[PDB]
Amino acid sequence: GLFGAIAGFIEGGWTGMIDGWYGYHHQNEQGSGYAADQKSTQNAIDGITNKVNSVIEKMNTQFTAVGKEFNNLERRIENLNKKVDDGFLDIWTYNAELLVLLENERTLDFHDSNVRNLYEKVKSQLKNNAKEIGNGCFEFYHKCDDACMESVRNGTYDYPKYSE
Amino acid sequence: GLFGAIAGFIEGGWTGMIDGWYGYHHQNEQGSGYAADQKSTQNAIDGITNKVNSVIEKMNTQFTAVGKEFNNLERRIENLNKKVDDGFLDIWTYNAELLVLLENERTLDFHDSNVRNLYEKVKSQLKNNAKEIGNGCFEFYHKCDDACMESVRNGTYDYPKYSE
Amino acid sequence: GLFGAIAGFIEGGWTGMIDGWYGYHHQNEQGSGYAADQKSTQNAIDGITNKVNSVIEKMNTQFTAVGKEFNNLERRIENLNKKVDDGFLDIWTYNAELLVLLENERTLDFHDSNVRNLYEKVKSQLKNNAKEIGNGCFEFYHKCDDACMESVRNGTYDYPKYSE
Amino acid sequence: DTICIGYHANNSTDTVDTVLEKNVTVTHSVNLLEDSHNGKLCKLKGIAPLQLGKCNIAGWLLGNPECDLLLTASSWSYIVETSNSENGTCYPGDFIDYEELREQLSSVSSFEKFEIFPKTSSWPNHETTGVTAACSYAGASSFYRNLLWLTKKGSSYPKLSKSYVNNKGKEVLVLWGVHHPPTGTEQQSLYQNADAYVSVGSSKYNRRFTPEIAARPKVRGLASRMNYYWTLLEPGDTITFEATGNLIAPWYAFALNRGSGSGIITSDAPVHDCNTKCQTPHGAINSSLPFQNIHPVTIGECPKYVRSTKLRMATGLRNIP
Amino acid sequence: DTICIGYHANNSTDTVDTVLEKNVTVTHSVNLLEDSHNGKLCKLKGIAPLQLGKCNIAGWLLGNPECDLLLTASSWSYIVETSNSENGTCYPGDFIDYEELREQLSSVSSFEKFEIFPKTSSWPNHETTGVTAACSYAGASSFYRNLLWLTKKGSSYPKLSKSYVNNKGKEVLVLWGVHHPPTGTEQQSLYQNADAYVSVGSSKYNRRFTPEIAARPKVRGLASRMNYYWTLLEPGDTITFEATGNLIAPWYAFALNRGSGSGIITSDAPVHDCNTKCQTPHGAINSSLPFQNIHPVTIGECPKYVRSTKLRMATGLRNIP
Amino acid sequence: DTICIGYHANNSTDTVDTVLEKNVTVTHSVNLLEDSHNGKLCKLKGIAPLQLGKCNIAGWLLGNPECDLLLTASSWSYIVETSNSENGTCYPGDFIDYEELREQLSSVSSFEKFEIFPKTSSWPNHETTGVTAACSYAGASSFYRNLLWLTKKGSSYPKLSKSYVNNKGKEVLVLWGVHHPPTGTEQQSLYQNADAYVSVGSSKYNRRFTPEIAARPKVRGLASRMNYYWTLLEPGDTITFEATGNLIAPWYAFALNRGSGSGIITSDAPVHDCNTKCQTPHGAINSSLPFQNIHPVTIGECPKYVRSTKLRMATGLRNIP
Ligand SMILES: *[C@@H]1O[C@H](CO)[C@@H](O[C@@H]2O[C@H](CO)[C@@H](O[C@@H]3O[C@H](CO)[C@@H](O)[C@H](O)[C@@H]3O)[C@H](O)[C@H]2NC(C)=O)[C@H](O)[C@H]1NC(C)=O
Ligand SMILES: *[C@@H]1O[C@H](CO)[C@@H](O)[C@H](O)[C@H]1NC(C)=O
Ligand SMILES: *[C@@H]1O[C@H](CO)[C@@H](O)[C@H](O)[C@H]1NC(C)=O
Ligand SMILES: *[C@@H]1O[C@H](CO)[C@@H](O)[C@H](O)[C@H]1NC(C)=O
């Protein structure tokens, strides 16, 4: 990955998380489970949806009959007409192919970016109250219940709470 | 943001700074004020100026009369001529539309990139001589006057003078 | 640089490393030398190789005779034929120019990214067992031999051995 | 206790291509390329196409005997010819500006056939009964339904003059023909006049025709030839026929309003009552996507034709289960 | 004490669209699309266009009595016709290769009209005074200014032979016509000869014209027709007219050096002394930008025509005050 | 006690352009633009081009006396004309649909010349010996090698009828001509008949020619003209010539299989035995790259033509030694 998160230091994805693209996996006294961050997920959805719609909706065409008929003494303008149709084919095929190749690359980087952004927003909040393992996991040096976990997920986590 | 600074952990811009795109807000015993970073601002300007000039000047045009006249027994080549003109319209419209959408996205990410680069350029020199508050602000663990401030902006700031 | 590594906090390149794009320079008691990371280099090569092949091979080419001959009463369709040839000329020139401009920028950013990814891949393993100087150099708080250096390059480095 | 940062993964087998890497498996994707058609020929802009059955545009217009079971509408958005349209001009010769006429008739909003020169009262001194084995229908010699073969009545072909003024308030399409005998003996056998001529004129049209007499290879058994000419008569304009022989006279003509920017489709696909914004000879397609691999030749507002077998756009992220 | 890292903001209301997000407000932007024209028809390559006033190219060339001649400029970079140019050939008939001739006259350097066959000394044995009510000037019957109508003198029309050698060191455009009477009686009334011809030839041009006589509808009161023919005579070459009748003789001709790659614009917009590199029928535009939505049909070095209402390129960053 | 992270650098002087910055020096790069040609005209798809030497296609086909071909090659992938092809029709006149004929003969896989109407046994009732000073070989008056000039025998020119059936299993190109005398005196002098005509016909071709008699400027000493006509005769089809005079009869014809999508190149570059997939008038180029600035007009499978002087794609990274 360009930003080094997806297929980066975070090695794999979670099949266990069905409600969003990006999220958290908490494990504590009460149990373990998956929860998706809806802000980062919804923002990504809105972005990609605008991207797909842009590629589709910016295409507008006027009513045209491509076919043309020529007799055996008209061969030259028949080949001219063929050069036009073939020319538009060469142009549109080449551009479409690359447009997908390039934007597929950009889309994956957009996801890669969002995952890293989410990671270091959490790093920023936890600071030294947790251990940075690598693999996208933070091991708490204190007790964190579902109320405490949600504070991290909500971005409301309180650092000057846990000295412990 | 792609790089997570603009509209990122740094939440907003400064209306008080008119001398550049990116800059610093200094506050100390001697006073407070805004100062723009000239290296990063000028490079960004040069880059964007080169981008705009590229989009405009890479277009080369030859003197052309688009219009053509045909009589009523020429109907086929009149429609051939229309297919050519309509074809270039479909191509140029679609490409221009996407070219702007895509490069606007890249331009904003370029700004997002420059802000973070400036941020971690300052962080790298200060190290533990300052505390990371967030929102792009550093609290000094020592005393810094206007002479010390200029050192940060100049990249000449001395860490092993300030443990104090 | 977009990722701030090449021409970034790492100020320059190594002429002494000929075996790869990205790598390490080790310095210790036993000696000094250069070594290239083969995974990040090969991945970059494969990526860039796919980019170059894409731009060239996505071009579809059919046998075509562009030239056409017209007599002195055919002038209108001669200029029509000229508008077609010139139209394809304007389109292909403009798109090709930007395609190179835009993808050259992305290619350079791609290398900048890879250098940073490698840097922070190394930082994560060493953690506090080494000091971060800058310019892409880490000073060990312990003694590291040629076997230990290879541990860093291979990503197999063992943290719970060297602590003191 | 532990909290972890991660991303979605699933059983998705979908794959896309990127500039750096081929065949990347992703969690979600959308298709930008239309790969499917309905295998039907549908209505364009709410109107069905013209179906000529066993006949092509030439045969239909001239009234080829095999074209008389056709049911044509007042209007059509385009014209459909099939592999089964074999019946053109049954009498060998050149159809002048034929490709042009086809192009110009591709779409019409008001179409009526009417009798321009009534068979009964128009030609009292000439024989209208001429037929040929070349135009045979059901094993019997016949002729065009919309034209009349004028020959001498009882020893002479008096100079004829007939004019039509266009009161239809729209363009009238007038078709006629000129017959060229292989020998001078046949020329006098039919029209009696060696010096015979055909002259046709209007405000926008003027021409003169003389019988070209010569030996030619037999086509459909005939060494003779018959050439076909047409003109679009403006509203209010008059057309005048004068001939001393060799004229194939207009019987029925067509009054019409031409559309624009349409064409002809050659397809064996069945015509149905469905609707579409884009028509291909293979079938109708959905115009919502920017690209289609269905057919290079289309009629409508259509996605651009590309050689691509696959265009697939990554929406989701890399799938790593 | 504190130092902070931040970015610019202002009161800018400028907005752009991005692939991910619509209508992002930015601090600075530039416009890539020219949406405005000056509503004037300006000079191309420093030269003003040809203005034909009440007449079209046909009327101007042939010298229609209602047009303005000899006021034609030495050169023009293109031709302007208006909705008010209705006066073409006043004598009904076909102008052959009319569209081609127009294209080749679209831009010319060194343009002068001259008398190729002076009315006084050219035709001693034929009557030059023929006029017509169809070509009217000031309520009186008249004729084309650049052509001369030759009719019989005293019951005879002797074979005429007239040649012009081009010494002008540039291309000479020669226009002429052939008159076709409605009846054979009128043919003999004017030109005296039932068997008649017009023959025109040069090194690169050969053709023959014969009086095709037929009944046709009255156009502008005339059942007669007049066809107009032209050729561009190369320097040093000779052109020879021979006729036994039916010739409408060249009176005035045009010597010129043809330009290339220009065209004709139809616009009612006023012509002024301004300059531009791109002209549209709506008006002149700035050619500095890559794209324009004003009009697809232009003459000059012009921005590419697009359907875009807005193309705006972000320079600055997201504005967050 | 130190490990460092860094990147490659070298002696590379290569520079590329980016959207943000000009002339960035990189360690490695590839070139996407073909800037070079071999300055030769080579074989296309393994087949050499047709070389006409001193003559153009018209002169070669008609068999102009100065055109030395012991045999026209059996096949060619395209046709090369040089600045040294000055000899077309040596007898002044128009070659009809000349551009079309050239286009359709651009590539052939089977080409043979044969005697369609043998000079000796074909025309017993007409004199075949006519020649002209305009067509001269070795200082003596001559004629086309592939055509035969038919004139009256002993003050009589009986109607001639001649047919050829095509058994060659491929297309036969039949050329002929029609002679147009300057005076009526000459018409009777050569063909004896003023009312003379030429008729040519087949299944797919029919046309008639009459002598146009007129005074013309002398071209190559002749006030007379000769028009040249051609038709491609289908396998199995017959062509029939009928004339009362003025016919320039086919002597030799060509049997062939047309290729498609080829053209004519005009270049003085030397023709060699090399091979290429792309030919330009400047020379052959390698087609492996997507773009070339050599020339817009090409024949082959070729890179797209652009005016770009430099397209260079960064592969490596910014070079900083
Ligand atoms: C084949 O091409 C050559 C040249 O391309 C023709 O040879 C001669 O070309 C010259 C032009 O440089 C002609 O000049 C004429 O010379 C005569 C005196 O001999 C003069 O009276 C004329 O006014 C003119 O200057 C010359 O006619 C021409 N040769 C002949 C025999 O006409 C050659 O004619 C070409 N072959 C054929 C069959 O046309
Ligand atoms: C064209 O000229 C004729 C007389 O030459 C005149 O009657 C007529 O009004 C002119 N056209 C228009 C539109 O006025
Ligand atoms: C086009 O308009 C004027 C030309 O007179 C020019 O000064 C201006 O800069 C151009 N417009 C833009 C948006 O560059
Ligand atoms: C064509 O052959 C190879 C493959 O690209 C290359 O070495 C050669 O230079 C090419 N030809 C030219 C003229 O560049």
UniProtKB/Swiss-Prot annotation, chains A, B, C:
Disulfide bonds join C144-C148. It comes from the Viruses. Glycans are attached at N154. This is Hemagglutinin HA2 chain. It comes from Influenza A virus (strain A/Brevig Mission/1/1918 H1N1). The chain holds residues 345 to 508 of 566 of the full protein.
